[model samples]
Target: SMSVKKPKRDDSKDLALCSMILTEMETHEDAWPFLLPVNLKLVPGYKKVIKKPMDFSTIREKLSSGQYPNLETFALDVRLVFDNCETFNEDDSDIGRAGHNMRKYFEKKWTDTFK
Candidate 1:
């Protein structure tokens, strides 16, 4: 019999990676990684496109470089995601679940940080 290596079957590696990743961000109290997707309506001539922050590398780069300025205006984008999720997706869906957590993160960060 030969031993085979499977990725998912390897719990140690999975745990190491999982442990490093910021999990249950809503519980962090300093939760800022509230993952959510939003639409970008940049130019009036161009049609809007749906985008996720994690997948939008250039956007992140631009923000880090101070292109978009402060994230104070970004709350609307998060609200949009959470609202649309509540209206459309089921609580079990990946997006919907994220939206649920994101809402809590926003509320927590909102009240906590504001204070």
Candidate 2:
């Protein structure tokens, strides 16, 4: 019988990678990754299947059901990822500008709902 190797549990590193990719996409408006299917074969021990077009419907459903523990955990995961990537720099980076623009867009679209 052959033995299987377990995957590494470096949540920190995974979060950093996720945040970096997300920030780049958000700031640059680049959808190349979505358009192109890249091979994850080089990434070892990552047995999880990569889903394209990153859907959040499951997460949204969980949050809507008042199951906040998982949602909070997800939020923390995002924060940890973003922190590791240093994507919220106040200096001369598109990260800060992109956040500002996103906020403005939301405000303009949802001002009535907010008040």
Candidate 3:
């Protein structure tokens, strides 16, 4: 019998990826759960300004319930985040990679659902 090896858990890398995804999803209503595991706990008296409009909770709930929104919205949100994030050139490489990976994940799910 062949045994499958488990992948290593790189918390640091995961953190980075999570951070980027969360930041990107901050203004989206269906891509926020990608950050829930990392930001599950809310801090008291800590509030961030919402410069952009987004339904964060809606996204979280959708993800938790395994209900995803339309692919058009998802893809557009991903593109918006990546486009806006380009301004932060210093960390573009890491953020861009995360964005790419996220899009790929979404794309796969979108395709699978249609089959």
Query: Which candidate leads in lDDT?
Result: 1
Give the C-alpha miss distance for residue 82 in model 2, angstroms. 10
Q: Provide the lDDT at 68 for model 1.
A: 43
Rank order by lDDT, top first? 1, 3, 2
Candidate 3 lDDT tens digits, 7-93: 854434432343344455455443442343222236322123222322344444544463544434444544544443343323446
Q: Of models 1 and 2, which has the larger lDDT?
A: 1
Cα lDDT of all candidates, in order? 0.44, 0.38, 0.43
Q: Write the per-residue lDDT of candidate 1 for residues 3-100, one digit (tens) a residue.
A: 86555432334222222222434344433323322334543322333233332233334444545433443344446545655665578877667668
* Model 2 agreement with the true structure over 78-104: per-residue lDDT tens digits: 233223223324535565554454444
lDDT (Cα, 0-100) at 110 in candidate 2: 35
TM-score head-to-head 1 vs 2, winner: 1
**Worst lDDT 10-window in candidate 3:** 45-54
Candidate 3's C-alpha runs over 4 A off are 1-58, 61-79, 86-92
Candidate ranking under TM-score, highest first, comes to 1, 3, 2
